[PDB]
Each structure stands twice: as structure tokens, then as C-alpha cells.
Amino acid sequence: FQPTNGVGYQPYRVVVLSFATVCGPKKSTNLVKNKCVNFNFNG
Amino acid sequence: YFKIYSKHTPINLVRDLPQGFSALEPLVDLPIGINITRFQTLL
Ligand SMILES: *[C@@H]1O[C@H](CO)[C@@H](O)[C@H](O)[C@H]1NC(C)=O
């Protein structure tokens, strides 16, 4: 695991995961009042 | 999802439950996946 090795055979700064207990993060907009709009609140 | 719904009220009697109505409100809602078939009280 030496730092002098080329990034193929050198040590792995590497990891993996599956995406309920947790999910990917929701975005959000401004709360656009009074206009006719499409909306999502909490899904 | 394991659940707890809960309530507090004043009373004045130990030896019977009250002939009066008040609903219980959620405080735990956790997707723990553990089934339940037994329990014991702590006091
Ligand atoms: C709960 O019961 C199901 C069968 O109905 C079983 O497959 C599952 O493994 C049980 N849960 C746990 C935490 O073992």
C-alpha cells in the first residue's frame, strides 16, 4: 500500500454503497405563492 | 416501521381507567424491521 506506486496497483482510496432507512437528497425551490403552479411538498 | 403513539392527562384515581376520551399522538415512527411478539415493563 505504498504512496509511491502508480494509481493502478497503488493502494485504494476506494469505496461503494447502495442508495426506507435512507434515500438520496431532495432539492427545493422558493415557496411561490398566489400564482398557478406545479408543486411538490414532502412528495 | 415500529410506532409509538402517546398521551398525558391529569387524573384523581388509581384503581380504574377513566370513562373519558382522548386520542394518542405519534412520537416514534422508525423502520427498524424487528418484529414484536413479547415485552416487559421497566420500573
Ligand atoms: C420478521 O418476520 C419475517 C417472516 O414473517 C422474517 O422473514 C423476518 O426475518 C423477521 N424479522 C427479523 C428482524 O428477523
Side-chain angles (χ1 to χ4, degrees), chain A residues 3 6 8 11 20 23-25 28-43, chain B residues 1-11 13 15 17-42:
Chain A
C23 298
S28 288
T29 65
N30 187 38
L31 187 68
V32 185
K33 297 180 183 176
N34 300 294
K35 297 180 181 66
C36 167
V37 299
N38 185 1
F39 66 82
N40 181 326
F41 290 90
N42 306 293
Chain B
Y1 294 87
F2 175 70
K3 316 292 182 167
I4 302 186
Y5 315 78
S6 69
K7 197 58 162 175
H8 298 69
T9 178
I11 59 165
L13 176 69
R15 292 160 290 282
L17 288 168
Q19 191 185 356
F21 184 86
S22 61
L24 278 56
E25 294 158 38
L27 291 185
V28 179
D29 194 0
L30 296 174
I32 62 170
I34 285 163
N35 305 320
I36 310 176
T37 65
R38 296 184 180 77
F39 82 102
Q40 59 180 315
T41 306
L42 300 174

